[PDB]
Design a protein around this ligand. Structure first.
Ligand code: MAN
Ligand code: FUC
Length: 61
């Protein structure tokens, strides 16, 4: 199967704007012919999670 057939969504808003926040995206999947036929469920990665804004929040006096 071609996993790139079903496009990924956009990276969501960073949970924490600083101090190592997290964000995630996922493929856009609608149940149809190509999906069930080509076994796109088992051999494809449907999610990608990443840490965002790992720079420490500025410490002010
Ligand atoms: C994951 O989704 C992104 C969004 O368009 C593409 O760049 C990529 O080819 C993949 O299928
Ligand atoms: C989010 O964004 C960064 C740039 C800082 O201003 C932080 O104070 C805030 O939590």
């Amino acid at each position: 199967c071609f996993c790139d057939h079903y496009a990924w969504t956009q990276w969501t808003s960073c949970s924490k704007t600083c101090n190592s926040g997290t964000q995630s995206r996922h493929r856009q999947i609608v149940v149809d012919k190509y999906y069930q036929e080509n076994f796109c469920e088992q051999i494809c990665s449907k999610q990608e999670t990443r840490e965002c804004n790992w720079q420490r929040c500025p410490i002010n006096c």
